[PDB]
Amino acid sequence: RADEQAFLVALYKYMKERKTPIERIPYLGFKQINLWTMFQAAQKLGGYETITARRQWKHIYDELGGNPGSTSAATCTRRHYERLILPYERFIKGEEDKPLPPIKPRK
DNA sequence: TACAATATAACGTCG
DNA sequence: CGACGTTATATTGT
């Protein structure tokens, strides 16, 4: 929890210095942004790499919770994640550990 | 004003 | 042929 929040406050400074602050990223599919949660959800559903190979965000919506009437709630989150932690998991996957391999065709 | 997010509808794929 | 999943479009809110 605390280190994801610390590294997303560091991203918040860097992304505000890139004309793309969290001040223009108001919500998460159902609830508030809560980055650390959609991150650990994506890391259970196979990182952003299994997500891109399978459109597994519908399953991230499963780890997030239920929201009546949605069929692409977490799908919108994909477009947030690709600017809100896809540029920062680069330190996790380049200078700590790579638990997400490039092998992912489909099923 | 314009931009971003969420919801709904349609299309495609799989069973 | 039917059901499920994914993608695209539209509407609403900030």
Curated annotation (Swiss-Prot):
It is found in: Nucleus. The modification N6,N6-dimethyllysine is found at K19. Residues 1-93 form the ARID domain. Widely expressed, including in liver (at protein level). Methylation at Lys-19 prevents DNA-binding. Demethylation by PHF2 promotes recruitment of the PHF2-ARID5B complex to promoters. Transcription coactivator that binds to the 5'-AATA[CT]-3' core sequence and plays a key role in adipogenesis and liver development. Acts by forming a complex with phosphorylated PHF2, which mediates demethylation at Lys-19, leading to target the PHF2-ARID5B complex to target promoters, where PHF2 mediates demethylation of dimethylated 'Lys-9' of histone H3 (H3K9me2), followed by transcription activation of target genes. The PHF2-ARID5B complex acts as a coactivator of HNF4A in liver. The ARID domain mediates the interaction with DNA. It is linked to Defects in ARID5B may be a cause of susceptibility to coronary atherosclerosis in the Japanese population. This is AT-rich interactive domain-containing protein 5B. The lineage of its organism: Eukaryota, Metazoa, Chordata, Craniata, Vertebrata.
